Amino acid sequence: VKPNYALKFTLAGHTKAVSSVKFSPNGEWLASSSADKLIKIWGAYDGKFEKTISGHKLGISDVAWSSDSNLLVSASDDKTLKIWDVSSGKCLKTLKGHSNYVFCCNFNPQSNLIVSGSFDESVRIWDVKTGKCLKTLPAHSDPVSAVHFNRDGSLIVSSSYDGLCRIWDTASGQCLKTLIDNPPVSFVKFSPNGKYILAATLDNTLKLWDYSKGKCLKTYTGHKNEKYCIFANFSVTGGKWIVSGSEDNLVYIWNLQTKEIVQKLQGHTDVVISTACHPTENIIASAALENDKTIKLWKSDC
Amino acid sequence: XXRX
Structure with missing residues (x-):
């Protein structure tokens, strides 16, 4: 019925x-990026600092793991992305092409492509092994705030302050569908089955969209979100929840079906910009802003 | 951070 996340x-x-925070797929670590130009790796189970990854010249707005947990990609204001060897700590490739801050990034499930989103309003698709930009999409008329691949890597969803979400064909570059009122979209991702997309807007609202029927199935509210591109999550390991940071410093958990808030995690002393759900365990990591500067690990029975 |  209700989860019982508690601070660990x-x-x-x-x-x-x-x-941003992201659990590695093998469930062992957590990677965090920060305005301090650094990526830090932590233990998922104990919360121990493992290492720092540095090389970027300005801050970092996003970080994502590859499918085998061997690689990180990071999106920096220095106008580049970096591909990191998670074990050696070393920078393997520097992805150059964007003409402004790189804001968001992800591997495809196969993890031989990277998708990026920028304040130059393009979505770029990079070849992981060579480091070349294969495609540039003039995707939006406003900065790109999120990009994401779907379960099989054939689709990319992207969102923007322009108020639209757009679904793309990875292979062709063609735009397949557009979801439309139209307040700024600060985040989107596919559901794990890839049938719905979850979208956050700067009117304090998460919407769940049926991707193919192009219609809105459910809306979640109660949190504060009017400024920041906050990460939202599907929790699937126990009960089925929607999880999300909030600008009032709480982590919000909703019942996906009933839209009711089932829990609010108190403890952070600043906006919670990023939450992430563990691959196998009932565990949420949350991260906060300048007045906090910490990641928290919470665990639940369901 | 940009995002921050």
């Missing part, structure tokens, strides 16, 4: 605001 670890180490 507060991870400290970032010297400026934390931009």
Whole structure:
């Protein structure tokens, strides 16, 4: 019925605001990016600092793991993305092409392509092994705030302050569908089955969309979100929830079916910009801004 | 951070 997330670890180490948290697919680590130009790797189960990854010249707005947990990609204001060897810590490739801050990024499930989103309003698709930009899409008329591949890598969803979500054909570059009132969309991703997409807007609202029927099935509210591109999550390991950061410093958990808030996690002392759900365990990591600078690990029975 |  209701989860019971409780605080386990507060991870400290970032010297400026934390931009995003992501559990590795093998469930062992957590990667965080931050305005302090650094990527930090932490233990998922113990909360222990493992290492720092540096090389970017300005801050970092996003970080994503490859499918085998061997690689990270990061999206920086220095106008580039970097591909990192998670074990050696070293930068394998530098992806150059964007003409402005790189904001969001992800591997495809196969993890031989990277998708990126920029303030130059393009979505770019990069070849992981060579590092070349295969496609540039003039995707939006406003900065791109999220990109994501679907279960099989054939589709890319993207969103923007322009108020639209757009679904793309990975292979052709063609735009397949557009979801439309139309307040700024600060985040989108596919559901795990890839049938719906989850979209956050700067009118304090998460919407769940039936992707193919192009219609809105459910809307979640109650949190504060009017400024920041906050990460939202499908929780699937126990009960089926929607999870999300909030600008009032809480982590919000909703019942996906009933739209009711089932829990609010108190503890952070600033906007929660990023939450992430563990691959197998009932565990949420959350990260906060300049007045907090910590990641928290919470665990539930369901 | 941009995002921050």
